[PDB]
Scaffold this active site. Structure first.
Site, mmCIF file in Angstrom:
data_model
loop_
_atom_site.group_PDB
_atom_site.id
_atom_site.type_symbol
_atom_site.label_atom_id
_atom_site.label_comp_id
_atom_site.label_asym_id
_atom_site.label_seq_id
_atom_site.Cartn_x
_atom_site.Cartn_y
_atom_site.Cartn_z
ATOM 1 N NE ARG A 129 -23.076 18.874 16.787
ATOM 2 C CZ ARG A 129 -22.313 19.698 17.497
ATOM 3 N NH1 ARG A 129 -22.522 19.841 18.798
ATOM 4 N NH2 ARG A 129 -21.346 20.384 16.904
ATOM 5 C CD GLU B 1 -13.354 24.338 21.829
ATOM 6 O OE1 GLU B 1 -12.611 24.460 22.825
ATOM 7 O OE2 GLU B 1 -14.533 23.931 21.909
#
Ligand SMILES: Nc1ncnc2c1ncn2[C@@H]1O[C@H](COP(=O)(O)O)[C@@H](O)[C@H]1O
Lengths: 179, 175
Positions: free
Chosen positions: A66, A103
């Site tokens: 991104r 994560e």
């Protein structure tokens, strides 16, 4: 909207419970979709960087993936080149790599060994600062190429995750903050 | 622009045997690294789009992930917004997704409205599987895909034939 900052802020869309229950995701997609909003975002970041470093920046370093949305555009606005820090395996030729927490597991970023000559002054750019894992890995990689990381910038910062403190000594700037 | 095109071509770097033996990788990294080269690449793509479609384009659609490098800058140059087509699982909210030969792409439900005209951008066109899947996803939002553009096409892989009837354009071609 009105001001440039609110032109950006009104284009950050909130999604509670994505990707997991309890969190509130900040979607930067509407910023890219509205050309006036994207223009405003790039301008705000560019003016910050120009005022802060006086035109003395050699490269922008954009983060997979991104950050790729803002890096090249910000670089172009400042008249600078953009180098890429990518997820492991994406770049051809000799690389340096570094791991970070993702994560529940672990992941790796990489940079080409010839991406920079020693002594280049660089600004790291990503869309959002969360844990600061990728930015930290980025700073490590750039350091091994003897670059001077001037700061890390993002559009959004999630303050409850304390990403900024992890980047020290490297300063961090963000346009907008949420928890 | 011969001089501008040369600025781009000179920056494209080829690596033999990547990501696997026998495969030649075309690396657009030095194009991004040289501001004059990046400017040239965006300018050439924009000029082509204006010379072909005038102002009749609504959005640029950038492909995850190397297409993200050119999408926003190209959209910005044209005064247009940029929408995202991502690997599945990345985007929040209601989505449409699809598989292709397996790999999966995804788009947000409200990315575009029916009849809106889109140009798809990625860095390189190979077999065309990726761009074709993007086109099909956009089709499911009733968008009109005017064209797919890229910096590089690998001509022997017949990507344009896969894209048809959506036209494809590239700055540079290799076998
Ligand atoms: N020889 C190559 N050099 C650089 N990128 C490639 C190459 N072959 C396939 N790709 C990538 O594969 C995607 C498109 O492939 P395809 O779907 O077969 O048209 C894009 O992300 C391309 O950058």
């Amino acid at each position: 909207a009105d001001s440039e900052l609110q032109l950006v802020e009104q284009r950050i869309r909130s999604f509670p419970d994505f990707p997991t229950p309890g969190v509130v995701f900040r979607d930067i997609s509407p910023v890219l979709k509205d050309p006036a909003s994207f223009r405003a975002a790039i301008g705000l970041l560019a003016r910050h960087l120009k005022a802060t470093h006086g035109g003395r920046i050699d490269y922008i370093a954009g983060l997979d993936s991104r950050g790729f949305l803002f890096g090249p555009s910000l670089a172009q606005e400042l008249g600078l080149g953009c180098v890429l820090i990518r997820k492991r395996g994406k770049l051809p030729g000799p690389t340096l790599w570094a791991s970070y927490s993702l994560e529940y597991g672990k992941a790796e970023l990489e940079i080409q060994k010839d991406a920079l000559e020693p002594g280049q002054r660089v600004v790291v750019v990503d869309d959002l600062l969360a844990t600061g894992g990728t930015m930290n890995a980025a700073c490590e990689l750039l350091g091994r190429l003897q670059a001077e990381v001037l700061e890390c910038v993002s559009l959004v910062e999630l303050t409850s995750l304390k990403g900024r403190e992890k980047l020290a000594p490297v300063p961090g700037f963000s346009l907008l903050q949420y928890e």
